[PDB]
Amino acid sequence: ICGDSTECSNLLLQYGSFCTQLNRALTGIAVEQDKNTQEVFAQVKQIYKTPPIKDFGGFNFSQILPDPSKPSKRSFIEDLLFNKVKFNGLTVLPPLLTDEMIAQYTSALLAGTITSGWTFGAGAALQIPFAMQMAYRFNGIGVTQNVLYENQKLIANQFNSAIGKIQDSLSALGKLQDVVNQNAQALNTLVKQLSSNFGAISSVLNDILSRLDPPEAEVQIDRLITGRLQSLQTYVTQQLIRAAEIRASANLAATKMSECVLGQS
Amino acid sequence: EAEVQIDRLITGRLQSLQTYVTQQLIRAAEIRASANLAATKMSECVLGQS
Amino acid sequence: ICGDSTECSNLLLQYGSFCTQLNRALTGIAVEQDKNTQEVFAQVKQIYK
Amino acid sequence: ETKCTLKSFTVEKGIYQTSNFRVQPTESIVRFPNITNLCPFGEVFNATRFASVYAWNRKRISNCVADYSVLYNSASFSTFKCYGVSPTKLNDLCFTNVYADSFVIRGDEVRQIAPGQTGKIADYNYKLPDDFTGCVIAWNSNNLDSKVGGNYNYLYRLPLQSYGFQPTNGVGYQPYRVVVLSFELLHAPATVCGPKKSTNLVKNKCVNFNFNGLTGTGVLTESNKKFLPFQQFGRDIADTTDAVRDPQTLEILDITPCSFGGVSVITPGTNTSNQVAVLYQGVNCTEVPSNVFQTRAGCLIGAEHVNNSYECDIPIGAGICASYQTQSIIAYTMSLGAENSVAYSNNSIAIPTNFTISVTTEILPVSMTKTSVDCTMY
Amino acid sequence: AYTNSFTRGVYYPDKVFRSSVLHSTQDLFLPFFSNVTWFHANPVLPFNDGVYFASTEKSNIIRGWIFGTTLDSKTQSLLIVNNATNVVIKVCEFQFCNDPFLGVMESEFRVYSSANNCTFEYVSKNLREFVFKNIDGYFKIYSKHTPINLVRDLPQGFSALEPLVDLPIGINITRFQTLLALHRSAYYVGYLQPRTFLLKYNENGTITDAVDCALDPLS
Ligand SMILES: *[C@@H]1O[C@H](CO)[C@@H](O[C@@H]2O[C@H](CO)[C@@H](O)[C@H](O)[C@H]2NC(C)=O)[C@H](O)[C@H]1NC(C)=O
Ligand SMILES: *[C@@H]1O[C@H](CO)[C@@H](O[C@@H]2O[C@H](CO)[C@@H](O)[C@H](O)[C@H]2NC(C)=O)[C@H](O)[C@H]1NC(C)=O
Ligand SMILES: *[C@@H]1O[C@H](CO)[C@@H](O[C@@H]2O[C@H](CO)[C@@H](O)[C@H](O)[C@H]2NC(C)=O)[C@H](O)[C@H]1NC(C)=O
Ligand SMILES: *[C@@H]1O[C@H](CO)[C@@H](O[C@@H]2O[C@H](CO)[C@@H](O)[C@H](O)[C@H]2NC(C)=O)[C@H](O)[C@H]1NC(C)=O
Ligand SMILES: *[C@@H]1O[C@H](CO)[C@@H](O)[C@H](O)[C@H]1NC(C)=O
Ligand SMILES: *[C@@H]1O[C@H](CO)[C@@H](O)[C@H](O)[C@H]1NC(C)=O
Ligand SMILES: *[C@@H]1O[C@H](CO)[C@@H](O)[C@H](O)[C@H]1NC(C)=O
Ligand SMILES: *[C@@H]1O[C@H](CO)[C@@H](O)[C@H](O)[C@H]1NC(C)=O
Ligand SMILES: *[C@@H]1O[C@H](CO)[C@@H](O)[C@H](O)[C@H]1NC(C)=O
Ligand SMILES: *[C@@H]1O[C@H](CO)[C@@H](O)[C@H](O)[C@H]1NC(C)=O
Ligand SMILES: *[C@@H]1O[C@H](CO)[C@@H](O)[C@H](O)[C@H]1NC(C)=O
Ligand SMILES: *[C@@H]1O[C@H](CO)[C@@H](O)[C@H](O)[C@H]1NC(C)=O
C-alpha cells in the first residue's frame, strides 16, 4: 500500500487490523501447501531399495526406476516430465521438501511395490517373486492364475511395449501448466494495479506529496489507499478460493496413492 | 457536517462486516467436506467392512 | 456500471483492470459448467441400442 | 517480540513471524545534466554604453540556462528588489520569456522604478504594471557616465531635457544604471529556467537516487545491455524501471530492488528455555545488521549446523529443520525415514506366523458455531 | 493518384529502452493499408492531426516543408529549409509566395519575402519518411532514411521511425506545404488517427513488427 512513504503509514494505521487479517490468510495457505505434499508422498515408513539384479520375470522397469548417473537421481520419465512444465512487498517462499526428496519418496514407493506387492502398505514388507505377485493380481480380477503362467512372455512383452509408448506419447501436462499460469497471471494484475490513481491526481505517492500541502494531500492519499487495499483484498480472496480447489485435488491424489499403488482396487 | 463523518464510519464498518461474511463462507465450505467424509466413514467403516 | 455513457466510462478507467478481472472470473465458471456435464454423461464410447 | 506479537506470556513451540528487516539508505545522490548555454548576461550587465531613459532598451532573453545567483550575490548592486518572487527561489523556477530593459537615471529616481509610483520618470518615461513579476537591479555608475563639463547625452522626457552629469555631484545626482528583469509566462510549453547541479554517483549500495527526473531507491550496478542512442531508461514486464542511463557519462546501469524480507523467531517454547533463533527470510546473510548459517530459505542466526539427520521438529524450509537438542538449537536436513532392505529373489517368500490386533483413532470436525449478526445494530 | 501503404508510419512512442515485449500502445498512428495521396513533380494541404510523409529520389528535389495556419503575416508560422549547405529551421512571421520554391549560377529561394519578429532561429534511390506532430506547444518530428532499390515508387515492408527533434514553439498549425528545387540548367501524404497497436520489440530494443488492432477480426 504505502511503500516507503511515511505520510501513508500513519493514515493506514487508521483502518484497524485489515492488514493483519490478510497476512494471516496468506500464511495459512502457505502452510497448507506443505501438508498437501506430505499427505500425497510421505506415505511410507522406510526408504526401500531395489536389489542390484533385475530378474523380474521378464518385466522391465528401467524407464521408471531412478537414474544413478544424475545429481537429482530422477528416472527417465521423471526427467521428461520436468522439461515440459523481488518486488513491492511480494515474496516467494521455498517448499519444505526439495524435489530430490520427492523423487526419493517416489522411488521407495516403487521399490516397495515391485518387491513386496501390497504387503508393505499394511505392515512389514514381505518379499514375493514378481510373477507370483502378478498371478495373485490376476486372481483379483477373476482370471484363473494359470492364464498368467502359460502366457508370461507375451504378457511381459505387452507391458514392455505399453511402457515404451508412454515416452513417445510424452516426448498432456496442461493441468499442471494451468495452475502456474493462473497464479502468475493473478500476481501480475496486483502489480499492475499500482499504477492507477483511483481518482486522485496521480498514482505515485511522491508527486502527490511534493505538489500539495498536507491538508490537501491527505485527501488524495486516502483515495490511493482505498484503491490499493481493495486490490489486495480481491487478490487474497481469490487465492483462498483457488487453494481450496488444489486441496480437493491433493486429497484425491492421496486416496489414489493409497488405493491404486498400495493395493488393488 | 456530521453526515460526512458518519459516512466514513459506515463505509468502514460495512467493509469489515462483509469481509467477515466472506471468510465464513469459505470456512464453512471446508467444514462441509469434512462432514461429508465423516458420513462416508460412518457408512463404510462402522456399518460395513471396508 | 455506466450503461452507454462516455462520461462515466472514462472515469471507470481510473480503477484499472477491475472489469477485466470480473469478466475473466465469470467466464471461467461458464466453461466449468460444460465440463461438469461432459464428465457425468459422456462416459460411453458407442451409442448402444 | 514474539510474546508481544502473540499477545501472551506463554508461547508454545512453533515458528512465528515477528517483524521485518529493511536495510537503510544513506545520503541522497542527485544526478543531472551539464550546462552549456548558461546565458551570457555579461552583455546587458556589462555594456560599454547604456541606453537613454526615454528610449530604454529591450532585450528578450530566451531559451537558455539562467543563473540568477551570480547576480544575487555579486554584492556590486546597490539595489536588488524582487517583487513577484523572492530572489533565492529564482534558480529553481522556469518561465516562458525573460525580458531585460536597460537605461540610466539619476540616483534618487531609482525609487520610481517600482509598481505603483508617480513622478516624471514613472509617469512618462517608463511605467511598470501594477502586478509586476520580475526584479529590479540598479548600481551606481558615476565614473563611466559622468564627464567633466557635463555629459549632455542622457536625456529624459518631461519635450526633452538632459541630465548634465558632472563628476563632482553629490550622491543622488550621479548616474545610476538600471536593469529591469521581467519574467513572463504566456501559454507555451516551456522555456528558460534556473540551473541544475548533480551530486556524485556511487554503486553497490542501497541508495536514494534521482536521474534527471527519475526518482527511486535501490542498488546501482554496471550493466551490459545496450539501449538505442535516444533511450533513457529501461522497463520490465509489469512496468517497473530496471535500468537507467547516466546523463553525464552515458552508461547503462541496472537498478536492483534493495534486499528485504520477513523475520521469524524459532523458539523451543518458554516452558523449556528462553533461547531463540532468528530467520531473515531470503536475505543474504552478509547484510543482516556466533552462529550464522546460510539456507536456501534465508539467513539463520543462533542455531548451529550439525551433520546428523533427525526427524523434522520445527520446519525451516527447503529440507532444513531445527530442534532444541544439542541445550540449544541446530540445523540440518530432515530424514525421510528409516531404511528397509527387502531380500528379494526369484524364488523366496516371507509368510507371517503371528498377528497383532491394533486400534487407532481418527478425529473429524462435523460442525461449527451458528452465529447471527444484526447489520443495523452493528 | 492514390496509393496503398502496407505497414508504414510506425514510430517509437517515446524513450525508455525495451526488448522482446509485445507492448501495447494507444497513440496517433497511420492505420495499416491506408489511402495515401500521390503527388508528382505543390499545393497547400491540411494538417488536422499529424502527418506521414515519404519521398523518393537520388537528387534532392524535396527541400523541406512550411507549416502554420495562414502561411503569411498577421500570424506566426514555422519554416524548415535545406539549401545545398544544411538544414535551417526558423520561426518568424513571414510573407510566403503562394507558389514558393527555390531554383538551381545555382541561385534560389523565391520562397518568402518577409522575416519579421523571429522568435526562434537555427542554422548549421532513397526513401525518406517523416512523421510530424504537434502537441502541447511542442512540434515533434520523427524520421527514417531507408534505401530503396527502386527510384520513385512506394515500396512494401516494415521500418520504425526514430525521434529527431523537439521544438517548444507554441505555434498553432492548420496547414502545410512543400518546397522543391526547380529545373533551370514523387511524394505522399498520410494522416494520423488515434489507434491502438501491438509492437514487437527485439532483444536489442528495436521494433521489428506490429499489429494494428482494428483492421480485422484476426488482429
Ligand atoms: C529395458 O528396456 C530398455 C528400453 O527402453 C532397454 O534399453 C534399450 O535396449 C536397446 C536394445 O535392447 C538399446 O538399443 C537401447 O539403446 C537401450 N536404451 C537404453 C539403454 O537407454 C533395456 O535394455 C531393457 N532392459 C533389459 C534388462 O533388457
Ligand atoms: C562583467 O564582467 C566583469 C569582468 O569579466 C565581471 O567582473 C568580475 O567579478 C568577479 C566577482 O565580483 C570578480 O572576481 C572578477 O575579478 C571580476 N572581473 C575582473 C576582470 O576582475 C562581472 O562579474 C561581470 N558582470 C556580471 C553581471 O556578470
Ligand atoms: C559533462 O561534463 C563533464 C565534465 O564537466 C564531461 O566529462 C568529460 O568526459 C570526457 C570523456 O569523453 C573526459 O575525457 C573528460 O576529461 C571529462 N571531463 C572532466 C572534467 O572530467 C562529460 O563528458 C560531459 N557530459 C557529456 C555528455 O559529454
Ligand atoms: C504370538 O504373539 C503373542 C504376543 O502377541 C505371543 O503371546 C505372548 O507370549 C509371551 C511368551 O509366552 C507372553 O509373555 C505374553 O504374555 C503373550 N502375550 C499375550 C497377549 O498373551 C504368542 O506366544 C505368539 N505365538 C507364537 C506361535 O509365536
Ligand atoms: C510445561 O511446564 C509444566 C510445569 O512447569 C511441566 O509439567 C511440563 O512438562 C512442561 N511442558 C513441556 C513441554 O516441557
Ligand atoms: C551473498 O553475497 C556474497 C558476496 O557476493 C556471495 O558470495 C554469496 O554467494 C551471496 N549469497 C548467496 C546465497 O549466494
Ligand atoms: C560434515 O561433513 C562434511 C563432509 O564433507 C565435512 O566437510 C564437514 O566439516 C562436516 N561438518 C561438521 C560441522 O563437522
Ligand atoms: C481513396 O479515396 C478516394 C476518395 O474518392 C477513392 O476514390 C479511392 O478509390 C480510394 N483509394 C483506395 C485505395 O481505396
Ligand atoms: C542556406 O540558407 C540559409 C537560410 O537563411 C542561409 O542562412 C545560409 O547562408 C544559406 N547558405 C549559404 C551558403 O549561404
Ligand atoms: C511584430 O511585427 C509587427 C510589424 O513589424 C510589429 O508591429 C509588432 O510589434 C511585432 N510584434 C511584437 C511583439 O513586437
Ligand atoms: C489556436 O487556435 C485556437 C482556435 O480555436 C485558439 O483558441 C487557440 O488559443 C490557439 N492556440 C493558442 C496557443 O493560442
Ligand atoms: C542486435 O540484434 C541482433 C539480432 O537480433 C544480434 O545478433 C546482435 O548481437 C544485436 N546487437 C548488435 C548488433 O549490436
Residue numbers in the entry:
A (entry chain B): 742 to 826, 854 to 939, 944 to 1037
B (entry chain A): 988 to 1037
C (entry chain C): 742 to 790
D (entry chain A): 298 to 455, 491 to 621, 640 to 676, 690 to 741
E (entry chain B): 27 to 67, 81 to 143, 153 to 172, 187 to 247, 264 to 297
Task: Quote the original article.
The spike (S) protein on the surface of SARS-CoV-2 exploits angiotensin-converting enzyme 2 (ACE2) as cellular receptor and mediates the fusion of the viral and the host cell membrane during infection. The activation of the S protein requires the receptor-binding domain (RBD) binding to the peptidase domain (PD) of ACE2 and the cleavage by host proteases into the N-terminal S1 subunit and the C-terminal S2 subunit. S1 consists of the N-terminal domain (NTD), the RBD, subdomain 1 and 2 (SD1 and SD2). Here we report the cryo-electron microscopy (cryo-EM) structures of trimeric extracellular domain of the S protein (hereinafter referred to as S) at multiple states and conformations, including the all RBD-locked, activated, S1/S2 trypsin-cleaved, PD of ACE2-bound, and the full-length ACE2-bound states.
Additionally, we solved the structures of the S(p), S(D614G), and the trypsin-digested S(D614G) (hereinafter referred to as S(p, D614G)) proteins with overall resolutions of 3.2 Å, 3.1 Å and 3.3 Å, respectively, which all exhibit one RBD “up” conformation and show no obvious difference. The SARS-CoV-2 (D614G) mutant is associated with increased viral load in COVID-19 patients. To our surprise, S(p, D614G) shows more digested bands, which means that the D614G mutation might increase the flexibility of the S protein. It is also reported that the D614G mutation can change the conformation of the S protein to accommodate more PDs of ACE2.13 Taken together, the D614G mutation might increase the flexibility of the S protein and make it easier to be digested by host protease, which might contribute to the increased infectivity.
